[PDB]
RNA sequence: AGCUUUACUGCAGGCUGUCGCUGAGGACUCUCACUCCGGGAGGAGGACACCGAUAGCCGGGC
RNA sequence: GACUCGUACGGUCACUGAAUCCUGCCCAGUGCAGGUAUCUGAACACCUCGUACAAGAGGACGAAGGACCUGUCAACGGCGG
RNA sequence: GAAACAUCUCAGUAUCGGGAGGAACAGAAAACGCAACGUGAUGUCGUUAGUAACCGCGAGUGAACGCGAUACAGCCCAAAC
């Protein structure tokens, strides 16, 4: 479906309607320093590594909407529930 | 030839004999080792923990 | 002023530099041709020996012992084993080479008792340690106020029961506080979890 | 499964061992301080159980009696020589350097003084080709060009017993008798005739190999069977 | 439970890089460790190989 | 340590199974082997960033191996609409 | 056992190798860290506590400091000269 790159809507920070911009959430990069990272190194040894021996799951026929809503004035963003959409393209 | 009765007839070989060390008829005169006390194999007497129940 | 000993000690802090370096490059050539256990008339590291209890006296013996370097020489499983227990290559023994050396020495001298041992280097495939042993039956030692303690019956086979210095360290008994919950007073009394 | 036959071999049990205690001599070139003054007389020609080829008993000037890898054309009475100055005739042994090029040699040494390693079977022979102060090139019976130290000793002439391979065994019994004098388990059961448990080619309702026969060089023992690291197979093209 | 394999997960083994042993003046010389041949003298090889450690590939041989 | 008191007319690993007449076509897949401009390819060391250090992120170089190319069926096998 | 199973669990159990004594082992802090102007070698018992901690964060696993007790005991070298 199509979607406006910008539009008026409630800003939970300002607590008043304002123009927000919509962006697709770009994945942040991992540091490899989180607790889970240390457990993988610590708990991996001879033979099977339990959970750390498992591999990536699969894919759902369609993914949900993963967007960021940025308040054009205060600059702060907020997240919303997403909805299944084969494709999402912005208008302007 | 049957492996039973007919094969029992050739058994006239002497192996296990009275042991000079423990007195049991377990000294294999061909191996020169006692299957019971270890004489001829070990200076120490043959003994294993599995010869009795684990907690005893 | 500095003792002469302090120089022997200071040289061995870097066995790969200086005269000591050339000395080793030479000795090890003869060493590699000697046997598993070689009794030697004088400690290669005097400061260390004396520091560990050595004494130019009757009943005090020293022998250099060579042990192979590396992990455990293990045989792969010949029956069912879960993946965890199917290893061979990465398994290492819980007793360090220096302890293996102290034991091989003590077996060579059945009447003697291990007093201590120290490292004297290694090449690419083996390590050498000099072990100091004591004749608990010689009166020269039975009458020595600094060593007669090793004459008591309860000191018999001390190396085989890990009562040696390298033994107690390898048993995780160094720390008297945190981290030694499963080591003191003994590995076995703690369920062997140390 | 169970270890394959190739694995039982290594254990060196009786079945796979050679009847060494029935062997005559570990044929090796004599050693000479130098000079070459060493010479001896052929006293007899015996059969060598380990090689199915004749061997020659020889008495040297210094009393030493020893069997030698006999080339063709050596008979009782003949006098052989061993040394840098040894004559250049059949039966004599001298370093490759003193040997004239283009001359058939046998029982060649790999490392000078090792006693002889190459070309020692029935009727074979090496071929000295190039000389030098450094390297002496020899063409081994396999057809390969072997660079060798000119100081490596070698015997002149082709090995005796040539043509042994020309006559067919005809019957199993004859093979049997020969096999019995070697370190070899015989007869041979085809892997494809065994059970899956016994060989990688075993199993099936009919006889055929499971996978392809050409196996990687890296294959582990127990699996390296069939055509080992074959660069090609068949006769075509 | 035995057996199979491009089932899942691993483990031996082979190959390969790297570190240690290991030294002198991306290709090269040398000798002194180390290896091998020689009864010895001495010869070949040589900082490689072997061995110890680690990494990638192959890996129903288990 | 066996093979081996052995050395290619050897011995190992496989297939077929006396003699006689013979043994066609196929290298795409799989296997093995050889080559390889380029692509891909780990760790140590090295460079950048980061941290008074460190974790960590990136880069450069690139072994075997793979991609790609070739050889090979008395190699696994195939020989139809 | 985890109602399969690979880490985990059974368990550092069974079993194996080596060895001491009448008891072994431990032991006079490079400790503790109720953080203190505090405690004061070591075992062990009661408790702390199924607490903290671990763990396909599943099933399960699991201390310590301290405290109350028992019994108490503190020393010898290496080096300097
Ligand atoms: Cl989206
Ligand atoms: Cl002892
Ligand atoms: Cl044959
Ligand atoms: Cl306190
Ligand atoms: K289990
Ligand atoms: Mg693992
Ligand atoms: Mg039966
Ligand atoms: Mg035989
Ligand atoms: Mg021989
Ligand atoms: Mg057959
Ligand atoms: Mg059958
Ligand atoms: Mg199989
Ligand atoms: Mg057939
Ligand atoms: Mg067939
Ligand atoms: Mg089953
Ligand atoms: Mg040798
Ligand atoms: Mg299986
Ligand atoms: Mg048939
Ligand atoms: Mg279960
Ligand atoms: Mg206790
Ligand atoms: Mg579950
Ligand atoms: Mg536990
Ligand atoms: Mg604590
Ligand atoms: Na851990
Ligand atoms: Na002893
Ligand atoms: Na532990
Ligand atoms: Na088959
Ligand atoms: Na079965
Ligand atoms: Na093909
Ligand atoms: Na092909
Ligand atoms: Na169950
Ligand atoms: Na089950
Ligand atoms: Na777990």
XYZ file of N, CA, C and O (backbone and C1' of nucleotides) in Angstrom, chain F residues 1-27:
189
model
P 59.589 -49.396 15.957
O 58.272 -50.154 15.477
C 57.756 -51.250 16.232
C 56.426 -51.713 15.684
C 56.356 -52.155 14.234
O 56.872 -53.469 14.051
C 54.469 -50.834 14.742
P 57.214 -53.996 12.571
O 55.802 -54.347 11.932
C 55.045 -55.492 12.358
C 53.900 -55.718 11.405
C 54.317 -55.909 9.959
O 54.691 -57.255 9.722
C 52.574 -54.333 10.046
P 55.791 -57.591 8.606
O 55.195 -56.980 7.264
C 54.058 -57.581 6.612
C 53.598 -56.709 5.468
C 54.637 -56.442 4.389
O 54.677 -57.511 3.447
C 53.631 -54.405 5.014
P 56.072 -57.926 2.765
O 57.112 -57.895 3.967
C 58.434 -58.425 3.799
C 59.434 -57.616 4.586
C 59.125 -57.438 6.069
O 60.349 -57.411 6.787
C 59.405 -55.339 5.070
P 61.127 -58.779 7.112
O 62.277 -58.817 6.016
C 63.160 -57.701 5.834
C 64.458 -58.162 5.226
C 64.309 -59.010 3.970
O 65.394 -58.742 3.102
C 65.400 -60.264 5.641
P 65.248 -57.599 1.989
O 63.715 -57.640 1.560
C 63.185 -58.719 0.768
C 61.871 -58.297 0.152
C 61.966 -57.195 -0.890
O 62.246 -57.681 -2.196
C 60.348 -56.587 0.701
P 63.068 -56.762 -3.226
O 62.248 -55.400 -3.315
C 60.964 -55.347 -3.952
C 60.729 -53.968 -4.513
C 61.780 -53.489 -5.507
O 61.166 -52.644 -6.465
C 61.718 -52.009 -3.687
P 61.879 -52.397 -7.877
O 60.662 -52.328 -8.896
C 59.855 -53.492 -9.144
C 58.590 -53.101 -9.865
C 58.797 -52.314 -11.157
O 57.776 -52.623 -12.098
C 57.581 -51.005 -9.615
P 58.162 -53.348 -13.477
O 58.058 -54.905 -13.150
C 56.778 -55.555 -13.031
C 56.956 -57.002 -12.620
C 57.734 -57.250 -11.332
O 57.254 -58.461 -10.751
C 58.844 -58.298 -13.110
P 56.032 -58.418 -9.712
O 56.556 -57.465 -8.551
C 57.706 -57.809 -7.766
C 57.860 -56.822 -6.639
C 56.702 -56.796 -5.656
O 56.932 -57.753 -4.634
C 57.194 -54.592 -6.347
P 55.728 -58.666 -4.108
O 54.688 -57.623 -3.477
C 55.037 -56.862 -2.304
C 53.947 -55.869 -1.933
C 52.493 -56.352 -2.000
O 51.712 -56.131 -0.817
C 52.741 -54.189 -2.988
P 50.182 -56.694 -0.735
O 49.313 -55.364 -0.591
C 49.611 -54.400 0.443
C 49.077 -53.031 0.077
C 47.600 -52.935 -0.263
O 46.826 -52.894 0.931
C 48.854 -51.649 -1.805
P 45.362 -53.547 0.959
O 44.489 -52.618 0.005
C 44.192 -51.258 0.363
C 43.394 -50.598 -0.736
C 42.242 -51.420 -1.284
O 41.113 -51.362 -0.428
C 43.410 -50.413 -3.067
P 39.991 -52.499 -0.521
O 39.062 -51.970 -1.697
C 38.445 -52.865 -2.623
C 38.192 -52.146 -3.916
C 37.590 -52.993 -5.014
O 36.182 -53.085 -4.831
C 39.409 -51.769 -5.885
P 35.448 -54.497 -5.005
O 35.181 -54.555 -6.569
C 34.337 -53.576 -7.186
C 34.529 -53.583 -8.678
C 34.269 -54.903 -9.386
O 32.882 -55.106 -9.633
C 36.301 -53.995 -10.148
P 32.270 -56.591 -9.581
O 32.757 -57.283 -10.927
C 32.294 -56.835 -12.209
C 33.159 -57.421 -13.296
C 33.254 -58.940 -13.319
O 32.179 -59.521 -14.045
C 35.419 -58.026 -13.459
P 31.699 -61.015 -13.708
O 32.977 -61.928 -13.970
C 33.604 -62.001 -15.265
C 34.848 -62.853 -15.183
C 34.607 -64.339 -14.940
O 35.709 -65.066 -15.468
C 35.805 -63.453 -13.123
P 35.654 -65.657 -16.957
O 36.824 -66.731 -16.974
C 38.087 -66.454 -16.353
C 39.106 -67.476 -16.785
C 39.410 -67.493 -18.270
O 40.318 -66.476 -18.658
C 38.983 -69.686 -17.580
P 40.080 -65.692 -20.040
O 40.193 -66.827 -21.152
C 41.399 -67.597 -21.310
C 41.179 -68.700 -22.318
C 40.734 -68.235 -23.696
O 41.835 -67.832 -24.506
C 39.303 -69.966 -22.976
P 41.687 -66.568 -25.496
O 40.454 -66.957 -26.424
C 40.582 -67.984 -27.417
C 39.348 -68.024 -28.279
C 38.900 -66.678 -28.830
O 39.598 -66.336 -30.018
C 37.055 -67.781 -27.871
P 39.794 -64.792 -30.413
O 38.315 -64.304 -30.738
C 37.640 -64.758 -31.920
C 36.334 -64.028 -32.076
C 36.417 -62.528 -31.867
O 36.884 -61.826 -33.003
C 34.608 -63.373 -30.624
P 37.428 -60.328 -32.827
O 36.210 -59.605 -32.111
C 36.406 -58.495 -31.228
C 35.114 -58.202 -30.518
C 35.083 -56.986 -29.616
O 34.879 -55.808 -30.376
C 34.096 -58.807 -28.496
P 35.611 -54.448 -29.946
O 34.820 -53.969 -28.653
C 33.388 -53.855 -28.655
C 32.883 -53.750 -27.237
C 33.534 -52.660 -26.398
O 32.871 -51.421 -26.618
C 33.472 -54.681 -25.175
P 33.671 -50.039 -26.455
O 32.946 -49.093 -27.509
C 32.976 -49.390 -28.917
C 31.721 -48.882 -29.575
C 31.307 -47.503 -29.103
O 31.991 -46.505 -29.840
C 29.458 -48.966 -28.980
P 32.559 -45.212 -29.089
O 31.254 -44.351 -28.801
C 30.486 -43.792 -29.874
C 29.243 -43.140 -29.333
C 29.464 -42.226 -28.143
O 29.932 -40.945 -28.504
C 27.659 -43.652 -27.674
P 30.791 -40.094 -27.448
O 29.784 -39.838 -26.242
C 28.627 -39.009 -26.404
C 27.962 -38.787 -25.068
C 28.862 -38.250 -23.971
O 29.010 -36.840 -24.060
C 27.532 -40.012 -23.121
P 30.374 -36.145 -23.567
O 30.382 -36.386 -21.993
C 29.332 -35.859 -21.168
C 29.914 -35.174 -19.958
C 31.016 -34.157 -20.231
O 30.932 -33.146 -19.243
C 31.829 -35.808 -18.778
